[PDB]
Amino acid sequence: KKVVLGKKGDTVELTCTASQKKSIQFHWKNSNQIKILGNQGSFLTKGPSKLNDRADSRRSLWDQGNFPLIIKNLKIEDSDTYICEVEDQKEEVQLLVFGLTANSDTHLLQGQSLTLTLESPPGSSPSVQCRSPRGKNIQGGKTLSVSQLELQDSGTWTCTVLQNQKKVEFKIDIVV
């Protein structure tokens, strides 16, 4: 199965695979067998879950043979596996949502220490590999603290997480 990464608030696409070209009835089930989205003929019946106002789909490819799952406002606790139910087959899709943020907004003077707060879901092992415009590729565990922060070390740092050969970019706002 394929796994994607969310940017903690944006939308993610979980496409399905079908070659029948019939627009058959499809079901969206999580790991706890709770209904979220489904088909009733040519309808959508929103099941009793916690993604009633967040789960959507790009339904142009109903006749093409792909059923995406669009979830907006992703959170830490929303990371779960989903299965697509077409032609009595189960296609498991894995979704992982993580993020990274700090605690100091603008009071970052010269020579002050840097604090970070990595927000990660349980059951995962992230690896922080931040990239700096000055060439500082600091690698470590989950929580990273830098004792040096000056005027020349400002800007949007490119901090990424390597996990199962997947990595995405983020932005950190530093004001000195």
Binding site: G41, S42, T45, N52, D56, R59, S60, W62, D63
Partner: protein, 447 residues
């Protein structure tokens, strides 16, 4: 003799002489002959070619009889939509019972308290119309329960319709409707039709001890309805339920003893006399303020029929619920955000489709205390009408002015049966389950 299965569609014999009935069907001469056979055969109400042929002919009749003005195919098209909020404030909820009949003064003036005015949406979109290479602009009204918008804070934003049936195919549409039509499926020579005639038929029957052979089928009704069934032909003097062998899709029939009749009426323009006013003998006409709402009136012993339905469900052999307790079983509508067919009614009244609030009827039937118990359902006509058989969508003309009355008899109920801690029987929008109830005991065999 020995007979094998077949999938060849039959020819239809109708009694009405409309355009579609004369083009696609033969005349019917009531040559219904039945021969009883002492054989055992397997009958399936869902996996039958006769059921699919009947549903296809009913869908063909629906498409040919009332032509849509707009035919829509699945394709998501980006468009800009504005939100015209029709805000009407409600008063305090009164819990007193009002058994409102047809002689009430509020229904005749058509100024009686019904459903809310839903927020209509205007959208503009550029696509190829009849010409395949030239983009054309259209502006049509859509409701608030069939739209999904990316930005709900702004009045104008990029939005999509539900199910993405957003490809307009134009058609010159005239307000035509079909009357009470009946037909039967007569078999060609060299072929026979077998009917399972046992009283314990529940949709599935691997062993049918009462098989009756015939050359033609029985009387039929083509009135489309969700959550109910009107003017049915197989309404016996009993209540019987059918259960599919793989899922929760069911169809429940009713009894003719309680006389469950159906009356749906929408007043239009009320005028005391054609307009002849002056100094003397001048009188006002009752103008319409909400022409988009209608009324449907439930008559007959509904609670005793509901109790017989509960008894038939408790006496079903495959029912896993509590037999000794019948108060646990309740009728519940699906929650909000579901289909319009899964939120209101969908029945035809001379070309007009009415969407009626089940909640007051649910409170009246299930005797839920503390809620508004009304023996009817307040309706609101939807200009945006969903489809049930094929993946499509249609937009109709604005409704006419005047009274469009309908009289029917309620014979069956479309519902989904779920068994658990609390037996929740929700209702489905499968219109094909009515015809699968009607001819599910019939099965074509090849001589």
């Amino acid at each position: 003799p020995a007979w094998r299965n077949a999938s060849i569609p039959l020819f239809c014999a109708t009694k009405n002489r409309d355009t579609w009935g004369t083009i696609q069907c033969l005349p019917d001469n009531d040559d219904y002959q039945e021969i009883a056979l002492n054989v055992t055969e397997a009958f399936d109400a869902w996996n039958n070619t006769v059921t699919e042929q009947a549903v296809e002919d009913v869908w063909n009749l629906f498409e040919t009889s009332i032509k849509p003005c707009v035919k829509l195919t699945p394709l998501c098209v980006a468009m800009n939509c504005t939100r015209n909020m029709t805000t009407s404030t409600g008063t305090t909820d009164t819990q007193n019972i009002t058994i409102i009949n047809d002689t009430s003064p509020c229904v005749r003036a058509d100024n009686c308290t019904g459903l809310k005015e839903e927020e209509m949406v205007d959208c503009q979109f550029n696509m190829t119309g009849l010409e395949r290479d030239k983009r054309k602009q259209y502006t049509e009204a859509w409701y608030s329960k069939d739209v999904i918008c990316d930005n709900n804070t702004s009045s104008r934003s990029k939005c999509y319709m539900n199910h993405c049936n957003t490809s307009v195919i134009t058609e010159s549409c005239d307000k035509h409707y079909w009357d009470a039509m009946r037909f039967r499926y007569c078999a060609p020579p060299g072929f026979a039709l077998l009917r399972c005639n046992d009283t314990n038929y529940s949709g599935f029957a691997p062993n049918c001890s009462k098989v009756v052979a015939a050359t033609c089928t029985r009387m039929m009704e083509t009135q489309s309805s969700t959550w109910f069934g009107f003017n049915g032909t197989r309404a016996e003097n009993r209540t019987y339920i059918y259960w599919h062998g793989k899922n929760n899709r069911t169809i429940i029939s009713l009894n003719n003893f309680y006389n469950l009749t159906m009356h749906c009426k929408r007043p239009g323009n009320k005028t005391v006399l054609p307009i002849m006013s002056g100094f003397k003998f001048h009188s006002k006409p009752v103008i319409n303020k909400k022409p988009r709402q209608a009324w449907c009136w439930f008559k007959g012993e509904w609670k005793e029929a509901m109790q017989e339905v509960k008894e038939t469900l408790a006496k079903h052999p495959r029912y896993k619920g509590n037999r000794s307790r019948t108060e646990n079983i309740k009728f519940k509508a699906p929650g909000r955000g579901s289909d319009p067919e899964a939120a209101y009614m969908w029945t035809n009244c001379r070309g007009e489709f009415l969407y009626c609030n089940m909640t007051w009827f649910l409170n009246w039937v299930d005797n839920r205390t503390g809620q508004k118990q009304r023996n009817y359902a307040p309706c609101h006509i939807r200009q945006i009408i969903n489809t049930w058989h094929r993946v499509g969508k249609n937009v109709y003309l604005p409704p006419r002015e005047g009274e469009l009355t309908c009289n029917s008899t309620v014979t069956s109920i479309i519902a989904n049966i779920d068994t658990g801690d609390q037996t929740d029987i929700t209702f489905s929008a499968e219109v094909a389950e009515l015809y699968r109830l009607e001819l599910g005991d019939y099965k074509l065999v090849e001589i």
